[PDB]
Amino acid sequence: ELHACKESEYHFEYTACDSTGSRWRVAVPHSPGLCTSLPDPVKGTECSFSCNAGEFLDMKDQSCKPCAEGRYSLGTGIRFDEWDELPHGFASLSANLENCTSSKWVPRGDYIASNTDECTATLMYAVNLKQSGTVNFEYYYPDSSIIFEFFVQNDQCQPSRWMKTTEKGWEFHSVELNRGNNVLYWRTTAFSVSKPVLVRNIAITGVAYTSECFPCKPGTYAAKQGSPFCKLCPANYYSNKGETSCHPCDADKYSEKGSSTCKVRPACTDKDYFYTHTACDAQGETQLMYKWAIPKICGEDLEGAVKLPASGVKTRCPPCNPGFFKSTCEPCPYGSYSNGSDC
Amino acid sequence: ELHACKESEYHFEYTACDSTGSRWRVAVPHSPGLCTSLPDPVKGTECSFSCNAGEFLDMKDQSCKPCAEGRYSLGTGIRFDEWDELPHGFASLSANLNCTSSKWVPRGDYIASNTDECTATLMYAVNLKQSGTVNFEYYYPDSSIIFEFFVQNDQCQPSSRWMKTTEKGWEFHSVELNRGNNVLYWRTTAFSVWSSKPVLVRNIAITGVAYTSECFPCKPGTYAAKQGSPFCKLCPANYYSNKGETSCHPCDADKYSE
Amino acid sequence: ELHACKESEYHFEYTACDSTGSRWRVAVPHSPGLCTSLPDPVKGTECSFSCNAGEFLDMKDQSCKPCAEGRYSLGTGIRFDEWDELPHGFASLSANLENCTSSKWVPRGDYIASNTDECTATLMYAVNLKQSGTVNFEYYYPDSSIIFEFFVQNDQCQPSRWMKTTEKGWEFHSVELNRGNNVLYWRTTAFSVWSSKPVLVRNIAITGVAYTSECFPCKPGTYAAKQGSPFCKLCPANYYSNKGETSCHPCDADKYSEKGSSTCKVRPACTDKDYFYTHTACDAQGETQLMYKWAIPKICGEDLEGAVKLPASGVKTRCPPCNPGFFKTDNSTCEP
Ligand SMILES: *[C@@H]1O[C@H](CO)[C@@H](O)[C@H](O)[C@H]1NC(C)=O
Ligand SMILES: *[C@@H]1O[C@H](CO)[C@@H](O)[C@H](O)[C@H]1NC(C)=O
Ligand SMILES: *[C@@H]1O[C@H](CO)[C@@H](O)[C@H](O)[C@H]1NC(C)=O
Ligand SMILES: [Cu+2]
Ligand SMILES: [Cu+2]
Ligand SMILES: [Cu+2]
């Protein structure tokens, strides 16, 4: 009476994991009572198949496929790059150490920000790692006035906690996590003897045993298949969802790095160009050569825009730097002093 | 904020046929709100692609596949081999020429006509999307009863009318049909000569209906060996089988089976 | 490489209806392979959305819009107001009643006409109503010498069939139809031995066919003012119009226009046939004055040369004796 469903009406699904850990790849119709003669169940993977980053589990043949072009999988983990609001699951508990309740870890923007005043602002995440994994987050440590603590309390609530200062770049941090219900804690306190502490790209690995491919967000492009992270489109290039490559933008429009849509180039203003003076010539006269800022996003064709002023007239230089004798001054050797005219 | 649609979620489907006949193979999630970045629509068959008996339409590559072992497709047609009750769509209307009781009685293996002098009409109003034929096996043992099978047209205009005697076993008959809503009539009126054996009809097969159809598992007691079978062969006596079997298992020594 | 298509290329369309009756509003590019990231298909209406007369189904939002000005939608039905030739789908079958094959429903013009001679001329239409609907047709029945039969056959070809005679106006008729492949019949028999007057049928409108129609620009000579009009009103006399016209454009004085005329026609010069003579009532002295008048639909200009003017008349001429049974007074105004 019923049909014999083709490949389009029956989908593979895994049974409930037993005590030993065996699963059966049973065939299930998409809606009840639509077909019979389903394919016979076969042995599934032993409840621990974890596809690597950039891969998804194909049910037809139980193996990790390398995904498609322009799409990312994030693997058996999650990421918290967005910080417009507090991401779901994060608890921004703030308590006075002994009102600072209004002072807590605030979602400043692309990065979260710590409280500058003297208070205990804890950012806590409670994630149940089904598999052994690690956490990778980028933390900015501008000043030593506010201390940074990152300790993952374990499954039994059982507890090197302090993070060293970061210079120059954002730096990178990573700790190991076990299979227990690990609860991550990000807390900062100010001694009030300021510069807030910033956190970006919280990456927790070993969560769901399997993920699914995700289209690249606007402003992001992925070229090769199986990309754990979808790269960012360069400046002056726009993009959309699922774009394999960034489309070049028009000349009259300017685009920032990873921009969803192009923005019209405004007319150049007096603020755009900056004055400057170059070195002296053979006669001792320096020529001033006005320059535009390298993030030049304005157009000369548009009316009402001040052009780069015509400069370069040779103007006699003042006496050269002390300790330097000339008109290309060279460093006078040690043991001789110069005021700019003679050494 | 939606995951890219995997091969297992989106199910290819054809758009509504336009006036010219162009169709699009749009990709649709099995339930709304699941996927994004679905495969792009492509041109489909021109609203008239039909797969012969024993084949089905595979949407992935728009062509006819040979089905599989132990399954019959019936093609672009229907079949009414079962007669335990009156099949759906059949109107066993009987008009006096009271004879309300007399009509085409649906015996299990075959349908039997009336024996008395009452006009019993077995009507089937079927809409044929494609020009096809109707085939059936009619038993006509006695000539006192007159057997008429005439095809009415789409505009109800009448359209060889009578049938010949079927001596020496069941015979086979077939007439052509048309694009319209042909309405088939089976009628037998018995002359009151004070004497008859009712006319018997089996295996009504109408082709050209509903365009492509899907494969079905073989009915119990019937087996199919190779893919593409338009019908499941009957298992030999003393042997038995079940649904979907490619062969008939032998039976026990202390058991018999027709 | 392909780029995401702006709203100028992808058009919303409905997938094939399933057994339960659910559809998906898939966004389909106009030409294959031009874009990606198309809008996600959403749930459609349950395969039975029927916009009323004067409304069209908007794909952007699944609701019935009131159409635009100057255009009609005809609703979920069809109309057969044109009868210059036999409309497509109509079978004017003629058969002998027992050679009368020559007799059939002739498309005389804006109306169809039945056969005067003794023969059976059936006007058959086979329309598949996807929805329950009605048929509305105006029929003219001048004389009873020719009988009119209008019966609707069902899907199983299994059949009030006789129509009433019409006096004065064209009258209006309507019956009900089912969801089957209904076949409408219009036949006339001429059982009268001595003659005849043909039977006329106009404005056959069958509703409930395709579940949805599309707005159509109004034909020339027709204007539509309010949106959602299931018909375009005909322009009055001396007014011309064209396709999609919201209002009928007034014509020039030298040109005359019939009702529902696409283009104006130059007024010919007045001829002796245009005016008709007549005599008015008597005066107090018993003299009548004749006052020639132009015909009510007079079409001719006085300015054009070669046109005879309205002749000067009104000379008092003594009336003959008044009507029998009527006696005149001093004012010669006879009273009963
Ligand atoms: C105490 O904390 C509450 C919570 O934010 C705050 O509304 C209140 O102003 C504080 N009291 C002070 C600052 O005196
Ligand atoms: C008369 O017709 C009815 C059905 O309408 C039927 O049940 C009844 O048996 C008939 N009478 C005889 C005597 O057969
Ligand atoms: C009757 O005969 C044929 C069709 O049967 C037709 O062509 C012919 O004109 C008819 N006769 C007359 C007198 O019209
Ligand atoms: Cu499904
Ligand atoms: Cu490009
Ligand atoms: Cu066996």
The sign of the CA dihedral C220, C223, C228, C231 is negative
Residue type for position A299? G
The residue of chain C with its CA nearest to that of B23 is C15
Q: Is residue C203 classed as helix, strand or coil in its secondary structure?
A: strand
Instruction: Please tell me the distance between residue B116's alpha carbon and the centre of ligand 2 in angstroms.
Output: 14
Question: Which two three-digit tokens encode residue C238?
Answer: 């001396």
- Residue of minimum CA distance from atom 9 in ligand 2: B98
Experimental method of this PDB entry = cryo-EM
Contact between A219 and A232 under an 8 Å Cβ cutoff? The reply is yes
Instruction: Please tell me the distance between residue C122's alpha carbon and the centre of ligand 3 in angstroms.
Output: 18
- d(Cα C53, Cα B158) in Å, to the nearest integer? 36
Contacts of C37 in chain B (CB under 8 A): 36-37
- d(Cα B178, Cα B87) in Å, to the nearest integer? 23
Q: Which residue from B185, B161, B6 is spatially nearest to B91, judged by alpha carbons?
A: B185
How many CA within 13 A on the CB side of residue B37?
23
Question: Which two three-digit tokens encode residue A314?
Answer: 């040779």
Q: Enumerate residues 6+ apart whose C-beta is below 8 A from A127.
A: A78, A89, A181, A182, A183, A184, A204, A207
Length of chain C: 336
- d(Cα B140, Cα B190) in Å, to the nearest integer? 12
Radius of gyration from C-alpha coordinates of chain A = 30
Is residue B96 in contact with ligand 2, taking CB distance under 6 Å? no
Contact between A216 and A242 under an 8 Å Cβ cutoff? The reply is yes
Task: With CB atoms and an 8 Å threshold, state whether B181 touches C16.
Answer: no
Q: Which residue from A47, A235, A301 is spatially nearest to A246, judged by alpha carbons?
A: A235
Q: Enumerate residues 6+ apart whose C-beta is below 8 A from B51.
A: B57, B64, B73, B75, B76, B212, B213
Q: Enumerate residues 6+ apart whose C-beta is below 8 A from C152.
A: C135, C159, C175, C177, C182, C183, C184, C185
> Which residue is it, tokens 């012969």?
B52
Task: With CB atoms and an 8 Å threshold, state whether C4 touches A240.
Answer: yes
Ligand nearest to the CA of C117: 3
Q: Are strands C10-14 and C24-29 parallel, antiparallel or unpaired?
A: antiparallel
Which of C100, C102, C115, C118, when mutated, tests ligand 3's pocket best, judged by the most ligand atoms within 8 Å of its CB? C102
- d(Cα A159, Cα A183) in Å, to the nearest integer? 10
Q: Which residue from A150, A161, A145, A146 is spatially nearest to A114, judged by alpha carbons?
A: A146
Contacts of A241 in chain B (CB under 8 A): 36-37
Question: Which two three-digit tokens encode residue B188?
Answer: 């037998």
Q: Is B85 left (phi over 0), alpha (psi -120 to 50) or beta?
A: beta
- Residue C305 neighbours by CB distance under 10 Å: 5
Cα-Cα-Cα-Cα dihedral of C293, C299, C302, C307, to 10°?
A: -90
The residue of chain B with its CA nearest to that of C29 is B41
- d(Cα C69, Cα C244) in Å, to the nearest integer? 8
The residue of chain A with its CA nearest to that of C37 is A241
- d(Cα B153, Cα C129) in Å, to the nearest integer? 17
Give C147 to chain A, closest Cα distance, Å. Answer: 53
Task: With CB atoms and an 8 Å threshold, state whether B41 touches C28.
Answer: yes
Contact between C285 and C332 under an 8 Å Cβ cutoff? The reply is yes
Give bridge partners of residue C249 from the DSSP assignment: C240
Contact between A140 and A148 under an 8 Å Cβ cutoff? The reply is no
Facing residue for C33 by CB, picked from B36, B40, B180: B40
Cα-Cα-Cα-Cα dihedral of B28, B32, B37, B41, to 10°?
A: 20
Among B2, B9, B30, B37, pick the best mutation site for testing chain A contact (most A Cβ within 10 A). Answer: B37
Contacts of A244 in chain C (CB under 8 A): 1
Instruction: Please tell me the distance between residue A267's alpha carbon and the centre of ligand 5 in angstroms.
Output: 27
Q: Is C102 left (phi over 0), alpha (psi -120 to 50) or beta?
A: alpha
Question: Which two three-digit tokens encode residue C75?
Answer: 């609703």
Beta strands across the sheet bearing B90-95: B90-95, B119-125, B183-190, B145-152
Q: Which residue from C69, C80, C72 is spatially nearest to C56, judged by alpha carbons?
A: C72
**What is the resolution in angstroms?**
3.5
Please give the helix or strand (H or E) that residue A18 lies within, else none: none
| CA–CA–CA angle C240, C242, C245 (5° rounding) | 100
- Residue of minimum CA distance from atom 8 in ligand 2: B98
Contacts of C1 in chain A (CB under 8 A): 244-245
Contacts of A241 in chain C (CB under 8 A): 37
Question: Which two three-digit tokens encode residue C101?
Answer: 């094959």
Task: With CB atoms and an 8 Å threshold, state whether A244 touches C37.
Answer: no
**C99 Cα nearest atom in ligand 3:** 1
**Burial tier of B187 (Cβ tally within 10 Å: 0-12, 13-18, 19+):** buried
Q: Is B67 left (phi over 0), alpha (psi -120 to 50) or beta?
A: left
- Residue of minimum CA distance from atom 2 in ligand 3: C99
Please give the helix or strand (H or E) that residue C10 lies within, else none: strand C10-14
Q: For chain C, give the residues followed by a break (C–N over 2.5 Å).
A: 98, 159, 195
